[PDB]
Amino acid sequence: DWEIPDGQITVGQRIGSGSFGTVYKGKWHGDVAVKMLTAPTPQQLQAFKNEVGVLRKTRHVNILLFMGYSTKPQLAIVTQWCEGSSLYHHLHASETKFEMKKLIDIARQTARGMDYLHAKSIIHRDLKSNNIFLHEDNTVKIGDFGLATSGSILWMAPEVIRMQPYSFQSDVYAFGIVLYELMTGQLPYSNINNRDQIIEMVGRGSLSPDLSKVRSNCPKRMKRLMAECLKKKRDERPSFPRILAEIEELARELSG
Numbered sequence: 048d049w050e051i052p053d054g055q056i057t058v059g060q061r062i063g064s065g066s067f068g069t070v071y072k073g074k075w076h077g078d079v080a081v082k083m084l085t086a087p088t089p090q091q092l093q094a095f096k097n098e099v100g101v102l103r104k105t106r107h108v109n110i111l112l113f114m115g116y117s118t119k120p121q122l123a124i125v126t127q128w129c130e131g132s133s134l135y136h137h138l139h140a141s142e143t144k145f146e147m148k149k150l151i152d153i154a155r156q157t158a159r160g161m162d163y164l165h166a167k168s169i170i171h172r173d174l175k176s177n178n179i180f181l182h183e184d185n186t187v188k189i190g191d192f193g194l195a196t197s198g199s200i201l202w203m204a205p206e207v208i209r210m211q212p213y214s215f216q217s218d219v220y221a222f223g224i225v226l227y228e229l230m231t232g233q234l235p236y237s238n239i240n241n242r243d244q245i246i247e248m249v250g251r252g253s254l255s256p257d258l259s260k261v262r263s264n265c266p267k268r269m270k271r272l273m274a275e276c277l278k279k280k281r282d283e284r285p286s287f288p289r290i291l292a293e294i295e296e297l298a299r300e301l302s303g
């Protein structure tokens with residue numbers, strides 16, 4: 048069992064509040080991060096066990112290392128502490144300009160982690176550049192840092208907006224949107240004023256990311272893989288084994 052006894056974790060500075068919990072930087076055999084959740088509902092009790100039950104089946108370098116959980120005194124999830132910023136903070140706030148060599152490496156590590164999740168039959172359900180942490184500004188760490196559960200429509204597939212929806216291809220579309228941010232430095236649909244139409248237009252199949260805003264030095268394989276990841280039909284979107292294979296081969300083309 049991975050239950051951490053009460054009294055071992057030294058809760059420290061608060062990292063950021065949410066509508067569903069708060070996260071602190073704790074001390075527990077080193078630097079750790081603890082997300083603690085007044086009265087737990089039967090849903091919150093199950094939602095906590097679902098998030099821990101998913102993190103228990105993860106043991107990969109590109110996935111945030113789950114370390115333990117606690118029920119006393121509060122429902123908590125203990126993970127490793129990583130320094131740096133998320134990919135959304137690098138490309139759309141800090142404006143960190145990466146070499147094309149490193150942009151492919153960030154996409155490669157992201158595809159490696161997404162490949163490992165699908166092997167374990169795990170759907171991320173909320174893959175975005177904000178949930179992609181750059182540990183030491185080098186290693187990609189995939190997690191779910193959402194503290195409210197929905198301001199994350201740019202990464203939602205058309206079939207996810209049309210409630211009939213989470214699948215491997217829905218995560219592939221999110222990965223395709225992340226590729227758009229990497230190759231453009233901007234979020235999709237930046238020229239749209241409100242989000243009412245973005246929900247309606249993308250769900251209707253008449254709004255797609257303008258694939259001409261990509262940088263000049265973007266390889267032709269990245270433009271083709273990004274387009275296939277953004278197909279409106281789910282069955283026309285590839286699987287991450289095929290996605291990772293073409294990126295790792297493309298990556299070896301840049302290293303001399």
Ligand SMILES: C[C@@H](NC(=O)c1ncnc(N)c1Cl)c1ncc(C(=O)Nc2cc(C(F)(F)F)c(Cl)cn2)s1
Pocket residue numbers: 062070080081082098101102105110111124125126127128129130164169170171172189190191192
């Ligand atoms: C305690 C808190 N840790 C931090 O926030 C943090 N960690 C490192 N460095 C920092 N600076 C910070 Cl601030 C977290 N508890 C659970 C987290 C999580 O990702 N759960 C999760 C993961 C997956 C995945 F399988 F896709 F990965 C899925 Cl599918 C669904 N849920 S994250």
